[PDB]
Coordinates of C-alpha atoms and ligand atoms in Angstrom, one line a residue:
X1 CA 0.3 13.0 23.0
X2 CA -0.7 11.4 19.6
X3 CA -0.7 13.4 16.7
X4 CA -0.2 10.9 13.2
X5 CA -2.8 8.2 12.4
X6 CA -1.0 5.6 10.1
X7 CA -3.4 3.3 8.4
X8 CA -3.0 0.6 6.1
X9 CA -6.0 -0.2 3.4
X10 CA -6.9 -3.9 2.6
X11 CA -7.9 -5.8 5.3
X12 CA -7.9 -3.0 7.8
X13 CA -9.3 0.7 7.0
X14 CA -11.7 -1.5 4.6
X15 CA -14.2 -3.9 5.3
X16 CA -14.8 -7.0 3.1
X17 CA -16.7 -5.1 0.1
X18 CA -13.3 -2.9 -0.1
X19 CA -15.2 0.1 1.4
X20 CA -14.9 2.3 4.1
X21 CA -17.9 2.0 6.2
X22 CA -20.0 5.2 7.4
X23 CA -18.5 4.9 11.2
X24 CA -15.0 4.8 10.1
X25 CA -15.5 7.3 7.7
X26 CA -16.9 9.8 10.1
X27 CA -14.6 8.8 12.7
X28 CA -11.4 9.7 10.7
X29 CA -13.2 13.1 8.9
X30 CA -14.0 14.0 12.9
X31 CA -10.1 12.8 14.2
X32 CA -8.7 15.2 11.6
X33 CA -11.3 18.2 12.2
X34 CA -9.9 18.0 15.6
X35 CA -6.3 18.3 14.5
X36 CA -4.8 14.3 14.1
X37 CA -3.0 14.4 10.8
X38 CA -4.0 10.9 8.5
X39 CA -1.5 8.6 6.6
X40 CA -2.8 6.1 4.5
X41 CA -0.1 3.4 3.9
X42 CA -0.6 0.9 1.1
X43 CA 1.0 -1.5 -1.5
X44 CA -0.9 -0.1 -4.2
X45 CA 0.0 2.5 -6.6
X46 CA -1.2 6.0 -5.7
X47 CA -4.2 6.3 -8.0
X48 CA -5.7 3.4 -5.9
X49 CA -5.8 5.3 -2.9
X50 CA -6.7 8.5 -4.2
X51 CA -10.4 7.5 -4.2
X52 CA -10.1 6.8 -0.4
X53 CA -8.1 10.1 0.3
X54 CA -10.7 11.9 -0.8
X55 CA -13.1 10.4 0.5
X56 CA -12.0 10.9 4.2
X57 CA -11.1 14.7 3.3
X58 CA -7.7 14.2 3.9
X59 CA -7.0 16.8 1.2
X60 CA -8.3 19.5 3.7
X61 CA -6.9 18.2 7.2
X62 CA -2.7 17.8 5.5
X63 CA -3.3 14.2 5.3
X64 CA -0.6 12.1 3.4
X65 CA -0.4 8.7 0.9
X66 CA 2.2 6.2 1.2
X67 CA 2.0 4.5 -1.7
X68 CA 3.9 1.3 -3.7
X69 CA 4.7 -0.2 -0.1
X70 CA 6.6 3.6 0.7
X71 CA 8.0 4.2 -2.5
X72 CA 6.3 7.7 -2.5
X73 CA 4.5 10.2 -0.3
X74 CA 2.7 12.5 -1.5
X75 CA 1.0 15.5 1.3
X76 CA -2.5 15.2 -0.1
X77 CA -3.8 19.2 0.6
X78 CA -0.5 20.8 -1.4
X79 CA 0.0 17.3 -3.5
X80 CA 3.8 18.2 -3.3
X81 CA 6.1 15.2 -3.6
X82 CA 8.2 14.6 -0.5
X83 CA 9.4 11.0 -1.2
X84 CA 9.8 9.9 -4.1
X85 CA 11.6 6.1 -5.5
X86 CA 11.6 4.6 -8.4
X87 CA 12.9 0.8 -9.8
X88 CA 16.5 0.9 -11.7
X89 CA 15.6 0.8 -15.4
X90 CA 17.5 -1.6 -16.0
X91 CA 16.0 -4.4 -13.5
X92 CA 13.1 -3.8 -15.8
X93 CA 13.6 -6.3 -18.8
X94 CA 14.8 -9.0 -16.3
X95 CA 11.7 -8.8 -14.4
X96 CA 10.0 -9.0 -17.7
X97 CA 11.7 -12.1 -19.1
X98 CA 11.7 -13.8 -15.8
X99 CA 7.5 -13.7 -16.0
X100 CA 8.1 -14.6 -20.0
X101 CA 9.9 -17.4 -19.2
X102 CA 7.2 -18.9 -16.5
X103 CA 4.2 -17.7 -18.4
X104 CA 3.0 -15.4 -16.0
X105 CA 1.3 -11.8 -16.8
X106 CA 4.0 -8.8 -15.5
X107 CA 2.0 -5.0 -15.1
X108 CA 3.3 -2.2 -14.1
X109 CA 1.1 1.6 -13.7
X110 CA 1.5 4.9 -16.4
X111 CA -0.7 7.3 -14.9
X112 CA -4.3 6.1 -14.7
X113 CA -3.6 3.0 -16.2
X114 CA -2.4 -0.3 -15.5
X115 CA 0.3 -1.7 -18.6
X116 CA 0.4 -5.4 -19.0
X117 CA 0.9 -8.1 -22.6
X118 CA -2.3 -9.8 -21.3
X119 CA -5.3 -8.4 -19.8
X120 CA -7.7 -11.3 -20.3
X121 CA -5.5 -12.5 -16.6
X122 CA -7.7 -12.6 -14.0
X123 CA -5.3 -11.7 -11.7
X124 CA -4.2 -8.9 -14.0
X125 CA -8.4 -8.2 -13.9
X126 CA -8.2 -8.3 -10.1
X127 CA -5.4 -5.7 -9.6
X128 CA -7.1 -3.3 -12.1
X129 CA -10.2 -3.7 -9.9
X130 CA -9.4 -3.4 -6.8
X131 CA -7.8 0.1 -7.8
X132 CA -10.1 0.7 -10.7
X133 CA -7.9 1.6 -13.6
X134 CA -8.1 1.3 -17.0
X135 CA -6.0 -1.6 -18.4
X136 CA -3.7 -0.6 -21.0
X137 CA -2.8 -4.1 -23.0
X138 CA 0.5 -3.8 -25.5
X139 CA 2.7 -6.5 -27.2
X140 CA 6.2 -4.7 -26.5
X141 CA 5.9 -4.2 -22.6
X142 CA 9.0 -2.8 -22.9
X143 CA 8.6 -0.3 -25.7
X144 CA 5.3 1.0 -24.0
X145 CA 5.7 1.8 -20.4
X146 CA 6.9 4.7 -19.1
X147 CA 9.9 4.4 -17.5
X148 CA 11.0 5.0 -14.8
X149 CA 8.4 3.1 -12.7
X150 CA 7.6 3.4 -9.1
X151 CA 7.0 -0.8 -8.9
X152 CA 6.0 -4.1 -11.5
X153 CA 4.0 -6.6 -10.6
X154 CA 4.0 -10.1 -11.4
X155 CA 0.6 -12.0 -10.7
X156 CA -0.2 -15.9 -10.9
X157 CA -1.6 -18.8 -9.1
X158 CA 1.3 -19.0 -5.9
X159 CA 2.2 -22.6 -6.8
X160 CA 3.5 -20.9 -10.3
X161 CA 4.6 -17.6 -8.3
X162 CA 6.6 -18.5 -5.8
X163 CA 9.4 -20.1 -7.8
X164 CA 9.6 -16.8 -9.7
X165 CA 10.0 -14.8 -6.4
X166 CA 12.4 -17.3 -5.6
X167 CA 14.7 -16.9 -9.1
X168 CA 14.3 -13.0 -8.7
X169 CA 15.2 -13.0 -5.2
X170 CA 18.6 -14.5 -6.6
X171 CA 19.2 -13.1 -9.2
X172 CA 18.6 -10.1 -8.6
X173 CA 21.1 -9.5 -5.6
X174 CA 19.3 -7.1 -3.7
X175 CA 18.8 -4.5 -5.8
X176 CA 15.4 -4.3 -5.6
X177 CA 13.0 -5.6 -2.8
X178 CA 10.7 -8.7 -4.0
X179 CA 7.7 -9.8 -2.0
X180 CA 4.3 -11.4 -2.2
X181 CA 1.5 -9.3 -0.5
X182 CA -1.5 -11.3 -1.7
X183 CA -0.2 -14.9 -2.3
X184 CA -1.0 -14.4 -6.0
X185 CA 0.5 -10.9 -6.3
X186 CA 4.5 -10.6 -6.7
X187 CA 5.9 -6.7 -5.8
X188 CA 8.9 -5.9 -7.2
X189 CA 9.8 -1.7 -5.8
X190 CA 12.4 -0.6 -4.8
X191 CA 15.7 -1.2 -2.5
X192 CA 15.0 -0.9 1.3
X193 CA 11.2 0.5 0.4
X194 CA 8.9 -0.4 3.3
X195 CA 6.6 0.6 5.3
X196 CA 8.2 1.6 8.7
X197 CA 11.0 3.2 6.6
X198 CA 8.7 5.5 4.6
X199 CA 6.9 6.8 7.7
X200 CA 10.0 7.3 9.4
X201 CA 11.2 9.5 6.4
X202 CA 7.7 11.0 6.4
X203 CA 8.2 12.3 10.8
X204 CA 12.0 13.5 10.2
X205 CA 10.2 15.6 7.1
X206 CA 7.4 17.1 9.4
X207 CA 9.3 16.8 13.1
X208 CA 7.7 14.5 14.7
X209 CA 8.5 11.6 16.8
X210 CA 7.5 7.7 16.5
X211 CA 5.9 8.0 19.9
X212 CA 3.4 10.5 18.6
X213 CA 2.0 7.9 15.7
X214 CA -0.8 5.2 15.8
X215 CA -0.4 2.6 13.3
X216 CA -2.9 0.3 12.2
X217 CA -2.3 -2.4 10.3
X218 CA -3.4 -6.5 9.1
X219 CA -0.6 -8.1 7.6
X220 CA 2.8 -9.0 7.9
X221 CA 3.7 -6.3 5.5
X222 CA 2.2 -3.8 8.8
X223 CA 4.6 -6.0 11.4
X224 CA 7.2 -3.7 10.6
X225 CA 5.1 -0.3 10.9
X226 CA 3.4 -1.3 14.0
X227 CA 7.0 -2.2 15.8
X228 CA 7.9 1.4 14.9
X229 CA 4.7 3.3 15.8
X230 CA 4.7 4.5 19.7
X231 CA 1.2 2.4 19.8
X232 CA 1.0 -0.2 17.0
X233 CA -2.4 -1.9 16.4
X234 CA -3.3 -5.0 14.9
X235 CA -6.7 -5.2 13.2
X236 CA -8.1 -8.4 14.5
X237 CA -8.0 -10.3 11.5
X238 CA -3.7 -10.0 11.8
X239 CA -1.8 -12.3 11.5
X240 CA -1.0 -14.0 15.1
X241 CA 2.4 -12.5 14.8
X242 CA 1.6 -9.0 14.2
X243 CA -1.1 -9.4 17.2
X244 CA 1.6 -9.9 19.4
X245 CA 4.2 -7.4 18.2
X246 CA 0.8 -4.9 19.0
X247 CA -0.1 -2.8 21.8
X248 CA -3.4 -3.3 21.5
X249 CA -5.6 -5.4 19.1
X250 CA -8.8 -4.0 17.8
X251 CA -11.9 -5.8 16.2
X252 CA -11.6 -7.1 12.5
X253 CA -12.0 -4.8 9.7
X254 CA -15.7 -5.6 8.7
X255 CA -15.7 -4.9 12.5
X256 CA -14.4 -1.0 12.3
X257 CA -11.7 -1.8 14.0
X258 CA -10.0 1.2 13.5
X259 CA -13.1 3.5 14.8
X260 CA -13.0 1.4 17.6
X261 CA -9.2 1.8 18.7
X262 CA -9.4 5.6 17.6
X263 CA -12.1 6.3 20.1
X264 CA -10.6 4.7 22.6
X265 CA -7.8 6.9 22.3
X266 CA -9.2 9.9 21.5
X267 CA -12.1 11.4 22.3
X268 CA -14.3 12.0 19.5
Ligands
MG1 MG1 -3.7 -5.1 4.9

């Protein structure tokens, strides 16, 4: 029957120290020995995965990353690119004077490292982190990033944030997609880039169906996935709304709630 396991990171295939416990680890290394292909689907830009990829082998059992919300997706064992989206160019410098204007730190990812005009942010600090990458700090954002990006981010307290989300989500006319994930951190990726659209890209590529994919997700960024998945699953820390778009809800992250729906599917 099920074939795909789709999972998201924060708040779901990690527990509260932003690790992957032993039982989830050994769960997913064991799923995948047995022939259930991995996805991991995340906000963050690829090299914050990677870590966690490799970690749960996914290099040897044809896992893929969806990383920057969907933007790309990468198949981990031949690291070929099968989906790959990046921001217009030119949305660039308006993103850029937008967080000028309303003194807020913009970043945006070349390679290993995370490009920003202030690293002394905290929140800047925080994304850097959580996906531990160098920080790269310049005075001509602009002139120093490599273009053409897969997604910026613009980080501040939300009180300051959300009237920038609001002026770009104007302005902008829909030419990119802009969203808070945390309430502090602003993604700006591409047009149409979600979740549930990237996997779907990702089963046309490999021929399979939706009915033969588990996703497991948290937040309201997931609802969309676990609509689309044949059996969606909210982590029990979801919101209230994704628990009720689910087929099933599992225990909270710090919980290994993904072990605990996988073996209760499958038998490991
Ligand atoms: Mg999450």
């Amino acid at each position: 029957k099920y074939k795909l396991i789709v999972l998201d990171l924060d708040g779901t295939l990690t527990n509260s120290k932003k690790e992957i416990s032993s039982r989830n680890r050994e769960t997913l290394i064991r799923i995948q020995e047995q022939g259930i292909r991995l996805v991991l689907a995340s906000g963050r830009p690829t090299y914050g995965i990677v870590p966690l990829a490799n970690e749960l082998r996914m290099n040897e059992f044809g896992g893929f990353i969806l990383s920057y919300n969907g933007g790309e997706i990468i198949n981990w064992e031949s690291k070929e690119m099968m989906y790959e989206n990046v921001l217009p160019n030119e949305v660039v410098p308006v993103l850029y004077e937008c967080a000028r204007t309303n003194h807020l730190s913009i970043l945006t990812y070349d390679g290993a490292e995370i490009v920003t005009e202030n690293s002394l942010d905290p929140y800047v600090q925080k994304e850097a982190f959580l996906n531990k990458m160098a920080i790269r700090e310049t005075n001509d954002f602009l002139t120093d990033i490599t273009l053409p990006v897969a997604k910026c981010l613009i980080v501040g307290d939300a009180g300051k944030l959300i009237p920038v989300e609001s002026e770009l989500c104007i302005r902008l006319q829909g030419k990119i997609n802009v969203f808070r994930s945390e309430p502090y951190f602003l993604e700006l990726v591409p047009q149409g880039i979600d979740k549930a659209l990237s996997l779907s890209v990702l089963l046309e590529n490999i021929g399979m169906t939706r009915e033969e994919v588990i996703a497991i997700g948290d937040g309201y960024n997931d609802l969309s996935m676990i609509k689309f998945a044949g059996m969606g699953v909210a982590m029990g820390n979801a919101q209230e709304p994704v628990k009720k778009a689910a087929d099933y809800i599992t225990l909270t992250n710090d919980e290994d709630g993904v072990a605990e729906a996988i073996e209760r599917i499958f038998n490991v």
